[PDB]
Every structure is written in C-alpha cells, then in structure tokens.
C-alpha cells in the first residue's frame, strides 16, 4: 500500500503533537473517544453514527463507536477497539494502520473499565460523553488548551491526509461527471442525486454533507435539502453542491450548468467560473484568506455592473455594500476531517481568535503550506434579500426587470478544492477535469 | 375514504383518548414536542431529524423540528408550527384545517404562545431541560405515555389507509431489488435500486434496509452494503420498508438464485409456514400462541429436510428449534417500526406475560381487530449458534453434512404486514401480488 508508507509519518507527527501538548499542560496523557450510537425518543431504533473527528484524526476507523485511544506520544498509542459477540450482526483489524497501534478488544461497551488507565487525574478525556466520562473517573474533559493546540495543527495536514483527500476528491468528481449527464437528460432533483450516489458508491449517510442537488429556482436556495421527485416542465439550471469520503476525509465540490449552454445565464454562468479560477489561483502563503474574500465581492460587484443587473460602476455597487444582496456567504473554508474544519479562525495555538461587516465569513486564517481549502464563489437570486435591497435607498439603482429575467435560474455557485503548496498551488477538483 | 374523509375520525378518536386521560390524571391539557435537530460533536452539522412519534401521531408534520401540539381533547388542539425565515431557508393541506395554528418563527419565541400556567400540562417529548426552563414539571408522566401507547395499537381507519399506501410503496421497492438481483447486482446496487423505486431517500425508511447475499442472509442486523457483486450467486434476503405520513411498512423476502435446489425448497416450505402462520392471527388469541406454532413448524421443517435426525416434538422438546428460529416471530406496527403496546396487557401498563420457553419476547398482547401485525418467521444458519449446538449432547442429532451444504446460502426470512379486522384478516403485502 502506498497509503502506508505516508501513514507512518502521520503517526509520528500525532505522536508529536500530543508529545507536545501533554507536557504543555502536564499530563499523563489523552483519550480519545470515538463516540455512540444516539436511541431515537421512545424507540428502539437508532441515528446513523457519526466519530468524533478528534478520534478518526488518529486512523480510519470511522463507523464503530464505543472505541478509545489512550496515547502519550512517546508509546504506540492504545486502541480499544470495539468488537461485540453475538448472532445479531457480522464482522479482527487486518489493515496497515494496526500495526501502528497496541490493539486490545471490547467484547462489551461498559466493560471499558478495567482497560483505561487506573489513575485519570491526568488523563485529558476527548469526547461528547461527558456522563460516560465522569462515571469511569475522568475529571479533566475537553480541555480548551488541548483541544485548540490539536484544532491548530489540524490545518496543517500531513502527507497522508492530503492523499485522503486527493481520492475523496476523485471519488466526488465521478459523481459529479454522473450528476451532470443526469441533468441533461432531463432527471429531477432525486432522479439526480441517485446518479450521484451510485456513481460515487456513496450511500446517503457517507456524504461529508447531505448534497444540494436544485434545479431552476431552487438553485437560490443555500441549503436546498430537498430533492424533487418529478422533473420539471422546463430545464434551465442545474446546481448540485456533493462531495464524498475516503478515510474519514473531506470533499467538497460544486457546480452550476445552464441547460441550453447559450444566453444570459450561460454566459453568467462562465464569468462567474472565469472569477472561481482566478480566486483560486490568489491562494499563497503569507496571504490573509480574507483578503481573497474581499477581492470576490469586487468580482461580483464587476459581474453585476457588466451584466447590467445593477446599474451602477463595480465600485460604487462595492461601497454601497450590494454585493451582499447577491453573494451573501463566505467565500470558503478549511476542510480536511470535517466540512468546515477547524482552526479556520485561530491566529496561534492559544486559541487568538481573528473575527471577520462579513459574518459568514469562515476563514480569516494566515494561508501557509499543507493547508487545504475551498473557493466557492456566488451569484445568487433570492426573494429575501431582493425585498431587502428594494426597501432600501439602493432601490432605484437595480435593475428590476433583469433581476426578473434571471430569477427563474435560481443562482450560481462554484467551488473547488485547493491544496496550498510552498511553490505552488493543487487544485484537485480542476486537475481531475471537472469543467 | 379518502385520507381527508377519514381523518376527520382520526382527530375526533385522539381528542377522545386525550379527554379521557386528563380527565384521569386530573390534568389542564397535553402538550406534545416535535423535537429538535441533534448536532455533532465539534461540529455544525446536524444528524437526521427524528421527529417525536406522540406528535407525529396527530398529523402528518414528520420533518420539522420545534412544533408543539397543546390538547385538551375538547377545544381545537393548538398547533405551533415552526416556520423560520432565513435566506438559507405554510400548511394547507386538509390536516391543516382541524388545528389552531399559530406560526412560530423563530424557536426561542415558543414560550410566549405556550400556557401561562403550564403547572397541570404534561409535556410529552424528548428535551426535559427545555420543557423545565419554559415552566413544565410533569415530564412524559408513566400513566399518560400507557394510556396512550395501549390504545395506539387500536389504528384508525386513516391511519390503516396509511400503512396500506407505505407497503403500497415498499413492495415496488422489493419488486425492483429483486429484479436487481436476479441480475447479479450487489448488494449496495441492489439497496440503490431500492431507493429509487420507492422514491426514498437512506433516511426516509423506517429502518436501515437489511440487503444481504449469500452467507450475509444469516446475519440478522446486518447493516453494511458490499459494493462488490459475489463471484457465485445463491441467495438473497431483503428486509426492507416504506414510510408514509409517519407510518411505516416492514417487509422481508427470500430468494434463491437458481429456483431449484435443497435451499429453493426450503424457502418454498417456509414460505406456505409463513402463509399459515399469518392466518393464524384471529381476534382473543395472544401472539404468543402463534409464535409457539411458528417453533412448531420450524421444528416440523428441520425434521422433514433431515437437517436434525428427530421428530418435530423431540426438536421443541430438546430446545433445538432457537437454533435456527433465534427472535421473536413478528411485532406490532404503525406509526413505529416496533410500535408501543405489544407487550401490555391493559391501559394501565400492565405487562402479558410471554409463552414459557420464550421470556424474551415481547409480542404478547391479546390480538383485537383494527391492530396491525408483522409476521416474519425464519429459519438461518448461523455460525455462532450452530457452534453452541456442537457443543452440547444434541450434537447427535445434527446432520452436520447437510448444515455445512446449506450454510453458503446464509438463511430464510419471510415477512408480511397484516390488519386484523372482525371476521377477517388483510394481508396488504401479498394484496400488492409480492410472492
Ligand atoms: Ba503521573
Ligand atoms: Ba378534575
Ligand atoms: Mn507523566
Ligand atoms: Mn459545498
Ligand atoms: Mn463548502
Ligand atoms: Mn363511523
Ligand atoms: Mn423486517
Ligand atoms: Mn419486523
């Protein structure tokens, strides 16, 4: 396995950070939970189990709950490794990351007692359970200097976690290919999103995200979680927001298409990608991420005086704060072990939080290399805002029958995944030839 | 009737059960919660929402988190109906019109559309904290959630109608995934083409589908979807269901590949068992009474096939027949997939004690009409428990050569979902022609 050869350094590193942090804040050690599996109200049944990212930090182990790691840094790192015996379901580890581990197995969740260390005074427990941890004699939960040390480092991946999502990456873009061909064949929302699944050989519950798969109006909608059972009378936009998962990892990919491939929208459609590109290709260490999300507001603010939404120069759309109106979220993330993952905010390991007249905005970061991100740019249509911006004294600067014309195409977003190198820039998302 | 004609009766028999109770337990009112969206740990994404069955009981709102129910059973139950406005982002269908809706647009508001008193109101739902810093002190009190779960095993005709049109749904689901089969698909492709001939999505269904080939037919709760076709196809087991305003359908089918064989027949036997065993249902009989002749059959099945070298009575007799028939032969079924009541003997909670020989089911409630039932016997061949059989005196009488011929092909399940009326029974399974 080439995985393996890179999951060797990713071991040492963690084992050096938590080296680190450990004698930083003096103790004996942290436990990593992996998490349960949440009873429904009244039932029997259960929620789909989700890990803690704090514990698939470690290795791929991502659907078992009831699992721990106890480790120091200096020995190999303890993995209680959850593995019931009874007729009810199906399943020893065999992997290249076992190895790496002093594996020992839980026949039984509460029988984790006599396997975690006798004295946790100093055992840093990591995990949702705080019950569960108070009951097997961890005081110490969740401490804050901890967690920001690890969430701080957490931007900074290693050679392996970059292959993890280099593949998550390619797994998403067969998806998306799928979708595509789906949308021009006249399927709807759901019709759509089975393609995807099945290309990806994704179930819904792998996805990083619950996909956005719109069509026309609803390509307005940010968080469009729906799909459409039947396809629309008229074809004319298409707005899927899909990622997948290798390994516990992250994509995060979208793309908008116009049905016809000419007219006002379509050409919309490729100024907005023509600006998607060049705001990826801004990304360099020493760079403020906010400063990219600036420069998008610019190019928004460009698009809608030259297409004659606004009836304004780009400037003045920038300085009356129009934008807004139309691209009303950040321009992107870190991601990595989660969606949005963390650090995107801190200035060092202590936590310096760096706030953002931009409050969706989830980067503001110092870029360096090994750092991961997405460019999502947008140009949206929705009623909300529109009937905001038409309160305002803005009002007679717009042009209304244009907002009209393009309304029924819903809105644009497109957004790649970038890996920030020392000398140079990765786009998985473009280099796999996503269009 | 229609669904709009019969819920009118459907309100007016809730309301009853609601004056009835409060009236009893000297209580204002009911209230019932919807629920909430559960988020992840270190994380901003959410899990699926699961909305609470005693609020779903009333109407068909399954989907939407921070709605309240406030019923007395005499005036118009009051509805609080959760609509936000957000750029991210009103009921009128014929439920609507038997409610007082008030709209609720943001959830920390609720409290100022609640009663003022809420000292003599029950709250009936998931988030005892929230329910104690709005003023609530009765929390899910035992007496009301039995009177309410022993009376839910009596449907209403609206709500019979709704079980009828959710197996309406899952046994299209069944035809395409056995089609899928036949085919050579895999287990993952089959579940997909599941999905999409049901018009559901992973989370819509009652339950994570059981989509199992081969050796995977003998595991009970298996949970994973190989996405790799087996080089040799024998068999293939499916347990899978529908939702429909809430309600939920619950079906498993058995097939071999070939249609001929040791293992066909023994499907074709268990499946006239099966038939049997269904038609057994009648009004003043305990579903431990069947569940006693399902042992019975089974025994008879492993005697005839020559799998055990007894007579059917030495079989039940010796405790042989768990071996192979390890649950419970079927449940009550509505508005949950293991619906409340089916272990009570009256409104009071009251416990129908199971048959001797089996104290682990829970199934045991005298039959009524107007009470839905599975009934899904089985016979496998699982590793774990034909060990334990080798291990004891009744080794003797196993014929391990023909154990180990049958074991390739996992095991047999077989279940339908069936109404019992006064003088008849209703199979809506086998009504939807699903051999
Ligand atoms: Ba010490
Ligand atoms: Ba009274
Ligand atoms: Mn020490
Ligand atoms: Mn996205
Ligand atoms: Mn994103
Ligand atoms: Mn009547
Ligand atoms: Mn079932
Ligand atoms: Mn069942």
Redesign the interface.
Known sequence: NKLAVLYAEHIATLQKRTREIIERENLDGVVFHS?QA?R??????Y??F?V???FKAWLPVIDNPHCWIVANGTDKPKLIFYRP??????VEPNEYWADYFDIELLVKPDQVEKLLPYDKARFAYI??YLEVAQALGFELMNPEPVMNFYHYHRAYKTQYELACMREANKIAVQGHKAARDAFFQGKSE??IQ?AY??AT?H???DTP?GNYVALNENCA????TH?D?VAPATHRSFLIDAGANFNGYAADITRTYDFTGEGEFAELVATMKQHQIALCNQLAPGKLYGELHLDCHQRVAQTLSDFNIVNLSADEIVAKGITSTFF?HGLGHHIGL???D?GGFMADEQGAHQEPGHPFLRCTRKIEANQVFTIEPGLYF?D??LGDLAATDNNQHINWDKVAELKPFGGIRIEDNIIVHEDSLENMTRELELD
């Open positions: 998490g949440k429904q109200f009244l039932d029997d049944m929620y789909p989700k803690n990212p704090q015996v009874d007729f009810w379901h199906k995990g949702e759901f019709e089975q699944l099945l050989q179930s819904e519950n995200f909608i940010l968080h469009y799909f059972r009303p989660q969606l949005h963390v929705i909300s805002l």
